[PDB]
């Protein structure tokens, strides 16, 4: 009955450990002060790597949410309906405290780093569910700092490990999600162009009339929303339900039909005299949310890195099994070269991101705070931009089967641009880097110290330092991407030189910084890279 | 911001008790020997009536199953993927033993009646999930009677309360489902036209080559399949997995794209030297499955009745709330007339079906067995045919909102024809009734006795008995539907006269049997009918 | 490579002549004064019966319209996007003047009858596209009678044979469609409960604020819309574009997700100070549209009849080819009986509808006008109610293949209830019949004359006349359906007795009016019925 036998078809990667298979991550977690979380990380790495877990990710994306503007009786409903897989993903994210680990009372030293490792494991399985998690993690410290009086009973659920999908006022719920409404049709990068208007009421609250053009996670229990007041652009707490239990006047008009990120609901919304509570002062909306923005930019970089890691893991498991021209694909000199360069890129990214996580963890230290202020937008720019060609290359390793929606690769590929577009996109990251280099007291000293610490170790690194120094003499706005990319590489290189094995740091520096390419990697480096990326080290 | 206020929109029926709201059913359960099950029935009636339960029914139908013929590597898979709601429905059906209550060791007197009541509650929530349940309930006694030796370890899971969706040989599973493969492209009514061929192997098993054109529940652990042998048309046990653990050679070719019944997978399949085990003798396939057929025909009648009951319950809850021309719709004389006639039809159907369930329960008694043999096809014909106009009328009570897929009514309406088409359809039921009346020893005596028992109580009933007697003098095949319908009504009428209150039996007889219509129901009868249909009695 | 041979599978009906195959229709067209249209009818009957034509019907339903509330820039759009098949269907409908043949200057005697025959041919191919056609045909004479001054240039396009899908003010278009906005969330039967409000402006036009809950064909160039004024419920011309070229303020909020009629867009809409022009006087909205309603009710009856005709034609073509138990299915005594009864029902319906079409054609005659006033709602009630069980029976002739969406039968079945629900639904038709019988001068005389004309010809007919006479003594509202059904049958019977062959009229009267059923049809009648239904006569 058959016309052929099927052979030389790799088995797809599943039922693996997402943590234990990543040598660079395991090393970074210990190095950066989160080793106490390693047993937990191995545990969730196993749970998240199962066929069942990966299926929840697939189901949540192929059954995207449905906007319910009205009920069957023609009354306004303004709700969103998700596939059950979505709620199961949210439950595990919250159980694992990806939304608030760092903010717990008695959080231990390294909690920001431990939380980043947890986030990176989840992000490999499914990306859309990270959006509410990212916004809630970033908004929580600000909300706890400024929590308006009628919402004092939100502190307990903000600190829980309990996802709660009930359509109830937040104070009645066991856990909460918080979103961000900034972008308007006339601009997302330039939020001063916002026309949503807030008028102060007798009781000190404000009435808002306007719109937000991309308003993710409409089901959040509140959104922090930018609006204009007499005193300038300001930040408001806009809860889904008012203190009295009535629904607030946020009208969900249309759900975005997106390239990727499809599991996540993003809406176009309008405020019809919605009630908001001013956070901070009138006119300080942009300043107030700077650090909130910093944390979301970090998560963008970490998310793209995580997706690159998953795509790479799929590619290498496939290339190990697939034979071409009589030999394993991973043994073919050109393929082995390409995959080894990919692995080297992920090693550097992991070292940089986790050092950056430690900086955010230790931000009570002014120099750590400054390092995070400078390298966060740099990391978002370079890593998020790299995501697209990196994932395409992984897909090409698999070949035609990597172009079919049955594979994880298309979904990863379709996700990659979102992280690059988020929060003013790549150019805004670079202009922010230039602003910091220009205006921030202490920056040039911080950089010099970091670079002197490793001076003499590598000729390519030292040449790149001199090139950046020259470039910073006249930092033209048109060179913002060149400068940001150079700065990012020097950050990565300094971490590699300090902490990677010497042959690895040497390989990294030559590949990344030796201005003439044509760099061949030694056999031993390629072997070590590919072994480290499949477990080996942990 | 609003253009209007929404008013006079009924709230849709949910969070009600499917059992306690049905006076006729509660009375029938006690009358027919299953009163010991009443507490359980009230419990599951509450569970099944919740918004959450009704949502599982919706989800399983709007997310229909997907046929997986191949995996991503191009190897044959032959599997079906369902929405999780489907599996949750199956779990509750099996927990409630709708597939096997009557067949348990130590099953108590009335178990067939108790099982019918349980089935009727489930059928109101979701219909497609009743297909595997119906086939498994009907096939189980036959399989236990004839179970081939290599499958002796199936007896325990056949008797469990555990749904098991694992892709494993049945002997390794905690519970089992059994299907039926009869229909071929050239005929489903006339199964002797089957061309699927079975050849005897050295070990006594047979190799099958052929097709089945409608093959529901392909995921069943076995199907009973008709095939031709040297000795005539025969019945085979065809398991999904062979005794050695290999998949059997059943190729799933195409999933039907159906009007209704969409939650249930129905496939077109081909046998490529599939292995089957002969049940019974060569050439006795048609005879062997007669009683199996009887049970499935009963479930068809019961299913259509249940859907009619749900549609009626929705219509009356709506008409009680909706106002037209200044008064409740249920108070408008013409609407109240129509709904009262509907209620009266369901009273008769409930009385007949449960008497029939008792007949099947007590089938060790030759007269009970004969009553079931005769009235089962009659009930399937009339009740399944009535389903379509009855549900359309309920939809029209709701008006335009009953035509929208948000309402339960369209799904009920789209389901109704399947039960009428099943197992040779309406004409085959009537030809079977004629065959029984002609050939079956004892029938005319059984009928006479039943009719004499109530003779003198109602003039319309006694006139209808005389009309049937005349008709049976020359029972032409072309009058098969007229005769079947008359017989059905006399069955219903005898139950009403014996057991309904006299004004109710009087109303039933005049409406159903008074050859000139124009029958107006008294105010008291309409009130009692509509109250009984909303709980009152239980 | 094969497991079986496919055989005994009928070829599906296509490439047939929808007109020439229908003996009763061809005879009715000539009888009722539209014989001059017979060549044209045969021509379009051929065109509409092709596989390509039937495919347009399928495509328009499986690719339903999409509501475009906003454009990609977030500006309001309020438009609907259709599959190209929809526009091709509309083009042929308008070329054939199904929307206005009767209203042309110099329309010839019999034009209403010719238009009804044309409508019936189209309705067999696709039903949703008849909605704009029906509303435009019904509204056109009223609009031409009352056309408000700023829209004088609409007269030419209202009278064209040119469908025009351009998004332009009607006065710039080559042809126009008109819709009807009556139903609100609180009621469609009782339109006096409408809360949409119209306020008179300085220039004599009115500003409307409110909603309509089912608002079909939102893309119409205008809708006639009921709204409350100081002077009572009134009818407004509400154009899609104002005289100055601006879009009118009609907000399309949601598209209905329907059981059937899926090719046709039906919206929930809101008026945000939309401009309307009063037709007639304040407070005469209900009266003004009575005749408009009459024409749409006629089209409902004609549409259900047409769908029944298509379903029957499919069933008989199938049963002629399919063999069961060694003989053609159409030769099996019970099946032949059932199909013959079906054919007889269509013969009566065709005779009645076309006599009714002639009444509407000759409505300058007071007695013809009265016949149409009385029999139109009666016909809508009985015929539209019959549609559901009739089409289900056809599906059951085909068997399981008739339950699959590849067949035309499911789409026909899912369409049938809409015609029964339309314009206040079945109960409102019956209450209207009772109102006419009670209040309308001349009615009892008109009926007596009609009945005396055929008195003595058939005993069952004469007995039914006496039964109706008795019933009309005390015409209780609760007997509205019994009375309407009796009246309808007497209408049909009088046409059959006057114009059918005597054996046919005899067969009709006995089957339809002989209060004890068990009526067997002669061999010759069954043969003549089935031959007439496949062409024979034309
Ligand atoms: C899936 C998804 C979900 C989203 N969810 C949210 C949400 O929940 N909340 C929210 O507020 N927003 C959300 N956004 C919107 C997102 O933040 C914006 O798209 C982003 O800030 C860019 O704004 P914009 O699209 O208006 O582009 P613009 O601001 O018009 O920018 C266009 C391009 O110009 C570049 N540019 C801008 N200014 C300069 C300059 N001075 N010099 C050089 N280049 C410049 C930008 O970098 C960008 O590349 C979401 C977006 C997506 C895709
Ligand atoms: C959703 C669905 C699921 C199904 N699942 C299964 C399944 O799991 N297993 C399986 O075996 N089948 C299944 N069936 C097929 C079903 O049993 C058949 O469709 C049914 O038996 C009718 O057979 P048929 O379609 O070949 O019609 P035919 O046998 O061709 O009958 C067509 C019509 O002719 C009538 N007729 C037949 N013989 C006579 C006669 N002698 N005199 C007068 N009238 C006659 C029939 O009553 C019917 O109305 C399924 C069907 C559906 C719709
Ligand atoms: C596909 C579709 C398209 C439609 N398009 C349009 C459109 O374009 N324009 C428009 O105006 N409407 C439209 N309608 C609405 C349609 O006209 C209404 O649904 C219909 O008039 C019934 O009104 P309702 O749904 O409010 O039911 P109700 O008025 O609430 O009636 C419910 C039931 O009660 C019965 N009833 C009402 N009064 C009495 C009484 N006095 N005594 C006894 N019984 C009574 C009715 O007959 C009906 O069976 C559309 C409907 C559908 C399904
Ligand atoms: Ca090698
Ligand atoms: Ca009353
Ligand atoms: Ca014959």
UniProtKB/Swiss-Prot annotation, chains A, B, C:
Residue span of region dsDNA-binding: 443-538
Keywords, in A-Z order: Cytoplasm, DNA-binding, FAD, Flavoprotein, Oxidoreductase, Stress response
Record's subcellular location: Cytoplasm
Reported induction: Regulated by Ada in response to alkylating agents. Also induced by anaerobiosis or by acetate at pH 6.5, via RpoS. Represses its own synthesis during normal cell growth.
UniProt keyword Magnesium, yes or no: no
GO molecular function: 3-methylbutanoyl-CoA dehydrogenase activity; acyl-CoA dehydrogenase activity; DNA binding; identical protein binding; sequence-specific DNA binding
Enzyme's top EC category: oxidoreductase
Residues annotated to bind FAD: 180-189, 214-216, 421-431
Entries under Pfam families matching the protein: Acyl-CoA_dh_1, Acyl-CoA_dh_M, AidB_N
Cofactors: FAD
InterPro entries the UniProt entry points to: Acyl-CoA_dehydrogenase-like (IPR052904), Acyl-CoA_DH_CS (IPR006089), Acyl-CoA_Oxase/DH_mid-dom (IPR006091), AcylCo_DH-like_C (IPR036250), AcylCo_DH/oxidase_C (IPR009075), AcylCoA_DH/oxidase_NM_dom_sf (IPR009100), AidB (IPR034184), AidB_N (IPR041504)
GO BP field: DNA damage response; negative regulation of DNA-templated transcription
A cellular component annotation (GO) from this entry: cytoplasm
This enzyme's EC code(s): 1.3.99.-
Signal peptide: none
Subunit-structure text: Homotetramer. Dimer of dimers.
Function per UniProt: Part of the adaptive DNA-repair response to alkylating agents. Could prevent alkylation damage by protecting DNA and destroying alkylating agents that have yet to reach their DNA target. Binds to double-stranded DNA with a preference for a DNA region that includes its own promoter. Shows weak isovaleryl-CoA dehydrogenase activity in vitro.
Family label: Belongs to the acyl-CoA dehydrogenase family.
Record text about domains: The N-terminal region contains FAD-dependent dehydrogenase activity and the C-terminal region contains DNA-binding activity.
Name the record gives this protein: Putative acyl-CoA dehydrogenase AidB
Biological source species: Escherichia coli (strain K12)
UniProt lineage: Bacteria, Pseudomonadati, Pseudomonadota, Gammaproteobacteria, Enterobacterales
Gene name for this UniProt entry: aidB
